[PDB]
C-alpha cells in the first residue's frame, strides 16, 4: 500500500483513560473558568459546576436502573442539560445515543427500538412523540422542562447525589457514543463510538506540543451546529472541554442571534458549515456587528467554495479560515487543517485539510482495488485507534465498511497533492447531504415503494445552492395509475423529517439498473 500520513509527528495519546477522566484530566487548572453558557438566559456553568452536574446526573442516572452498557436516548437540542446527560452516562460506563428533536414518531421510535434505549431525556413537546412506545416497553421519559403525566423532570437526576455514584469498571473498548449513520449503502445504523475511539480522536485534534487545531481555555467556541452529531459533540464540545475552553451553547440558528452572541461574548472559535455562511452572506445586518474576536473559522461537511471563503475573509477579519473533514464512522475526524497549528502550515483554498496524526490514510482505486499515488483521485480509507468499533448489531455492515487490516473505506472519492493536502472530489456512496444532515435514500426508496401506485424508485441528490444538496426520486408508476409529481411528495413528507423531503420527481418507464440488479446511480446524477 501507498499509505499517506500527517505532516505532523506522532503523539502519546492516554486511550486508557475513560471519556470523562480524559476530557477533565486537567480541569484543576481550569475549575473556576467558564464551561458552558447558555446563549438564551445568560446562564454560566463552571468547570467546576459542569463535572459536579455531570457526577449528580450520573447518580440520578444509576437511581433509574442504569447499568453498564445500558443506552440512554438524548433527543435535545443544544443545552447544558445534553452534556449533563452525555457525561453523566459517560460515568456510568454507559450509552447515549443522540437524536434529533424535530424526528417524527416513527424515526424517534426506530432509534430508540435499534438502541434499545431504556430512557429518553427530551422536551414536553416531543413526549407525545414516544409516549405510548414507552409506556408499552417500560422506557422512562425524563423532560427538561416541564413533566406531562407519567414523566420524570430532569431535576429528578440534578437533585441525586454525587457519591451515590457506582464503583464502575469502565474498558477502552467500551461503547459511550451511538450516533446514527447509513455508512455508505443502506439504512440508518448505530455507530459504536469508544472510549479509546473519542479520546483518540480529541488527542489527534487538540494535544501535542504543536496541536492541529490550537484551542485553548481563553477561547469561547460557539456551539450552534448540533451536539446530536457527532460532528459538533467532539469537535465542539469534548474537544472544547479538553482543553478548558467555553462553550457557547446556541439551541437554534438564527443570524441575529448568531451575530449578537458573536459580539457579546467575544467568540473566538466558529465552527460552521456553507449554509451558515450564507445566511451570513445574505444578510446585509452583518455589517453593522463586531465579529472581530473570531480567530478561527473552521468549516466542513461540504464545500465551502471561493465565494463564501470571500464571505469569511470579509465579515471575520481577524479570522483563519480552514475546511476539515469528517464521517461518523471515523469518530468523526479524519483530515484537519494545517493553518490551525500552533505552529501552522500553509493551505491551499479548496483543500479539507491533512490527514490526522497517530492514524493512516491510503487512496483506493474503486475498479482495481490497487492503492494510489498523489494526485491521483480514489476512494479515501483510514486506519487508526480512532476509528468506530462498528455498527451496533450489524457484523455484515461492520465487515463491509471495515476491513480485516482495519481500513474503513468511506465511499468518498479524493485525492492527496504534493504537500499533503487532501481534496474531495467525488462521492462513490448513495449518501445525500441536506445542510450537513444525512439523507439515505434506501430509507426513502423503501418509503416509496411502500405506495400503492409507486412500482419502482431511486432517490440521488441533486446541486443545491442553499442546501448543497436535495433529494430528488426517479419514480416508475404502477400499471393504470395517475399518480401525480406533489402526491408523491405529499405521501413521503407526512412521514420524514424536513430534511428527508423530496423536492423533485421525474416519473421513468424503468429504472437503469446493472446486469446484478442495482441503481445505476450515477447515471442518475448525470442527467440532472
Ligand atoms: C446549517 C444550519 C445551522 C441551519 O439551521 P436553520 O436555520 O435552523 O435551518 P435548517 O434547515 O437546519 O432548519 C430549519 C427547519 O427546521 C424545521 N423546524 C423548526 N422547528 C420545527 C418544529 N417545531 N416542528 C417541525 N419542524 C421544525 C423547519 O422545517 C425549518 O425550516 P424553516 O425555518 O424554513 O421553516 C443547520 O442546518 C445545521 O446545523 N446544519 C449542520 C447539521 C450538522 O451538524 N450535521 C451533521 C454534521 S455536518
Ligand atoms: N469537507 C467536506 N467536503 C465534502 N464532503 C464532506 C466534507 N466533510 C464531510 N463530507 C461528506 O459527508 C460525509 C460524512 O457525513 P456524516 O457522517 O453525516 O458527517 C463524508 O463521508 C463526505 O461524503
Redesign the pocket.
Known amino acids: 500500500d501507498i499509505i499517506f500520513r500527517s505532516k505532523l509527528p506522532d503523539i502519546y495519546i492516554p486511550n486508557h483513560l475513560p471519556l470523562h477522566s480524559y476530557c477533565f484530566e486537567n480541569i484543576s487548572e481550569f475549575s473556576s473558568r467558564p464551561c458552558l453558557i447558555n446563549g438564551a438566559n445568560k446562564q454560566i456553568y463552571t468547570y467546576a459546576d459542569v463535572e459536579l452536574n455531570s457526577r449528580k446526573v450520573a447518580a440520578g442516572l444509576h437511581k433509574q436502573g442504569i447499568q453498564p452498557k445500558d443506552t440512554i436516548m438524548i433527543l435535545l437540542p443544544n443545552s447544558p442539560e445534553f452534556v449533563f446527560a452525555f457525561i453523566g452516562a459517560s460515568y456510568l460506563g454507559a450509552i447515549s445515543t443522540m437524536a434529533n428533536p ?1 424526528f417524527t414518531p416513527a424515526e424517534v421510535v426506530k432509534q430508540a427500538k435499534a438502541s434499545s434505549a431504556k430512557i429518553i431525556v427530551t422536551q414536553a ?1 416531543h413526549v407525545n412523540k414516544v409516549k405510548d412506545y414507552a409506556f408499552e416497553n417500560d422506557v422512562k421519559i425524563i423532560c427538561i422542562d416541564s413533566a406531562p403525566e407519567g414523566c420524570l423532570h430532569f431535576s429528578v437526576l440534578t437533585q441525586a447525589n454525587e457519591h451515590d455514584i457506582p464503583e464502575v469498571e469502565i474498558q477502552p473498548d467500551d461503547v459511550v457514543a451511538l450516533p446514527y449513520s447509513s455508512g455508505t449503502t443502506g439504512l440508518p445504523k448505530g455507530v459504536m463510538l469508544t472510549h479509546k475511539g473519542l479520546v483518540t480522536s480529541v488527542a489527534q485534534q487538540v494535544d501535542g506540543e504543536n496541536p492541529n487545531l490550537y484551542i485553548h481555555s481563553e477561547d469561547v467556541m460557539l456551539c ?3 451536539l446530536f ?4 459533540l467532539n469537535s465542539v464540545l469534548l474537544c472544547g472541554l479538553r482543553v478548558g475552553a467555553a462553550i457557547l451553547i446556541m439551541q ?3 443570524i441575529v442571534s448568531f451575530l449578537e452572541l458573536i459580539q457579546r461574548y467575544k467568540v473566538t472559535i466558529g465552527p ?5 455562511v450564507l ?1 451570513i452572506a445574505k444578510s446585509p445586518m452583518v455589517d453593522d456587528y463586531d465579529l472581530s474576536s473570531v480567530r478561527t473559522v473552521m468549516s ?3 464545500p465551502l467554495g471561493k465565494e463564501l471563503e470571500d464571505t469569511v475573509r470579509a465579515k471575520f477579519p481577524n479570522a483563519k479560515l480552514g475546511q476539515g473533514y ?1 464521517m461518523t464512522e471515523a469518530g ?1 475526524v479524519l483530515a484537519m487543517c494545517l493553518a490551525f497549528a500552533k505552529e501552522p502550515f500553509e493551505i491551499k483554498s479548496g483543500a479539507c485539510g491533512t490527514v490526522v496524526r497517530n492514524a493512516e490514510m491510503k487512496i483506493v482505486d474503486p475498479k482495481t482495488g490497487n492503492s494510489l499515488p498523489r494526485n491521483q483521485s480514489g476512494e479515501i480509507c483510514i486506519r487508526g485507534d480512532q476509528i468506530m468499533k462498528g455498527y451496533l448489531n450489524d457484523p455484515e455492515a461492520t465487515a463491509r465498511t471495515i476491513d480485516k487490516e482495519g481500513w474503513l473505506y468511506t465511499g468518498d472519492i479524493g485525492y492527496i497533492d504534493d504537500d499533503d493536502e487532501l481534496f474531495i472530489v467525488d462521492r462513490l456512496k448513495e449518501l445525500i ?6 439523507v439515505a435514500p434506501a430509507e426513502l426508496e423503501a418509503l416509496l415503494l411502500n405506495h400503492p401506485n409507486i412500482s419502482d424508485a431511486a432517490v440521488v441528490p441533486m446541486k443545491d445552492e442553499q ?1 448543497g444538496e436535495v433529494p430528488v426520486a426517479f419514480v416508475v408508476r404502477s400499471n393504470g395509475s395517475t399518480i401525480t409529481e406533489d402526491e408523491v411528495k405529499d405521501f413521503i413528507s407526512k412521514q420524514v ?3 428527508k423531503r423530496i423536492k423533485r420527481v421525474f416519473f421513468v418507464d424503468a429504472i437503469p439498473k446493472s446486469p446484478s440488479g442495482k441503481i445505476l446511480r450515477k447515471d442518475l446524477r448525470a442527467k440532472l
Not at 452529531?229 to 459538533?232: L, M, T, V
Open positions: 424535530l413537546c450552534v451546529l448540533p452529531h457527532i460532528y459538533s437554534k440558528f438564527d460552521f458549515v456553507p449554509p451558515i445566511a466542513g461537511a461540504a469528517g468523526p447531504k441536506y445542510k450537513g444532515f444525512q442546501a423529517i424536513f430534511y
